[PDB]
């Protein structure tokens, strides 16, 4: 038993992290096959003024790069720029490249972040992409290029995130491996601000099922609500729509409680917990996905 | 910025996890040099009655073991029993044994768990050893033998925990690599219940400093209480004593807030936040050490 936000193991991703340096600027990259992908920030000139990346790219010289894995330097063959990332062709392939694909996350998706500094991983944690296209992680100077990944049920690594910048608000912004910044934020300092976060209803439903399976049921509500009604309430109260109901069948069967009864319970609990808690939480928890709850409680995939 | 409970990267430990089978029973072991350490539960008979491990060990037959790392079959040369673990000598040394030591944890220590099933890692998360010598993890059937570790600055891996059992209460119990069970709980099913844990005051102070440094200060009390005063209050309210304000000097300086002001805040907050949160937590958090907070937020040591 227990429900804890965890990361999928990081070994296969650690073996792909590299240190990328251009002039004095250092950040992290990901080495897959004969290509290193990293944020284009690495070629920015030192200045406080707006960076013109097209000009930075045109004045770029290959000899200014150094790329290394565990202190072993790689030859740089060529560099191209794609959105907010660089693709650096190197002169040998990573022999420890995992079976992998590239995936662009959608809000509500869980993934793992490997926080790296100077091409060496320091921490790994699970995180959710928020409705405002940011995450809440923990990064300090040098974390740029820290990768996000998921490992599919079949073992394939999905590469989905490269850390780009922290907004003034503290929100964390990354791009996918194609260079598209999640939420269309600028990949350089600015005054941009993310939209207000919405609670992930699908995850709250999963959380309440976990609570029921632990004998915590004081909060169950007997009012009638359907998905359409809940979704209208959600829009008015800072919650996402619930996506669907049937996917919860494994948990609905184990508990005898329908998703619609949980939706009614969310509406009630919005009023307050009146000093009580659910699995130790004093407010609704949207940290855990359905997949996570089923995996952690029953050891199976959906 | 940010503060998030993370795990240290798991790669070097994944390379030491093996599948250990005895008869139909499968669990996890840790392969270092030519020895695999695993919980002695692996040789228990299938029963609901009390297990006599001395008898089980006396009747053990080496041929019944199957030990493997990723399809690499390891020949069993001999087995000895030490407290709650077996040391299985195998015919091959793990050439990926990391620089390591064995370390016995004390309450308040943070470490990492690699949750494994059938010799394969599934998740990694950080935990903190409670005053009752249990942890709050997430484990289901098959997790026995999942290792806990901490990586020192010089890269030395401290192997500190092997998962043993979940109590009826849900608390998680493990042993060290010498075979001593943390808290001296029984390593088989029983009606044992862990003693009540105390909130780790030193860790809460570290957490509140982290909150301040991340701009979260709604909870900050306007008054102060001295260490002696807090300590008398703590004894009556299920908190550990705070010993010295001096170790907090660096964060007190960065924030302009004294430990005494944080201690007064704790007293006001010890029953909950209502519906509010601090760094995503519904109530006071004692999961982070001072060293952990400083390392994560400033990349330095104490």
Swiss-Prot record, chains A, B:
Coiled coil spans: none
Domain Peptidase C30: 1-302
Active site: 41 (for 3cl-pro activity), 144 (for 3cl-pro activity)
Protein origin, superkingdom: Viruses
Known function: Responsible for the majority of cleavages as it cleaves the C-terminus of replicase polyprotein at 11 sites. Recognizes substrates containing the core sequence [ILMVF]-Q-|-[SGACN]. Inhibited by the substrate-analog Cbz-Val-Asn-Ser-Thr-Leu-Gln-CMK. Also contains an ADP-ribose-1''-phosphate (ADRP)-binding function.
Annotated protein name in UniProt: 3C-like proteinase
Organism: Human coronavirus NL63 (HCoV-NL63)
